[PDB]
Amino acid sequence: MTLSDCQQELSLVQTVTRGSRAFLSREEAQHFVKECGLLNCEAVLELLICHLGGTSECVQMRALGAVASLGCTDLLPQEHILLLTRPRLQELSAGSPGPVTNKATKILRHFEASC
């Protein structure tokens, strides 16, 4: 589909979202951010959003961590990151109380504050 030519971006998102810890390490975040600078960041973000849906709680937490890390760079305007992520972040922030709901809320509030 429209992401089929984004195999490098897909491999990056699969790497960053696998792991048993819910928080990216400093080294994992910096690597993710460096690779984002070389790939299509918007395609990366859309693949992260895909991983916010069906997966496990840990994958969701790591995907949200990667969204937060990308939002704290200048790779995309922060208003553009908000445009792309607001619908899913709003849906998660409306969920049952818990770690994913809490983290999605903080990310959404931060992106809204910046704009």
Side-chain angles (χ1 to χ4, degrees), residues 2 15-16 25-26 29 40 49 74 93:
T2 60
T15 295
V16 80
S25 65
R26 181 149 204 283
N40 188 298
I49 291 171
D74 61 345
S93 73

Side-chain angles (χ1 to χ4, degrees), residues 8-78:
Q8 298 170 313
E9 291 80 4
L10 176 56
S11 311
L12 175 68
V13 160
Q14 291 172 327
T15 295
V16 80
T17 56
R18 77 168 52 104
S20 56
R21 183 160 288 169
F23 310 103
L24 273 40
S25 65
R26 181 149 204 283
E27 293 69 29
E28 287 169 336
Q30 283 196 309
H31 166 264
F32 173 76
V33 156
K34 192 224 72 201
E35 290 293 329
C36 278
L38 298 174
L39 300 179
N40 188 298
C41 261
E42 184 180 352
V44 171
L45 203 56
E46 291 287 336
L47 293 159
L48 286 171
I49 291 171
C50 288
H51 281 68
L52 293 178
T55 59
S56 69
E57 163 169 278
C58 187
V59 168
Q60 284 180 314
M61 291 288 292
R62 298 186 61 94
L64 286 177
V67 167
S69 289
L70 184 52
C72 295
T73 77
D74 61 345
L75 290 173
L76 290 179
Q78 258 212 31

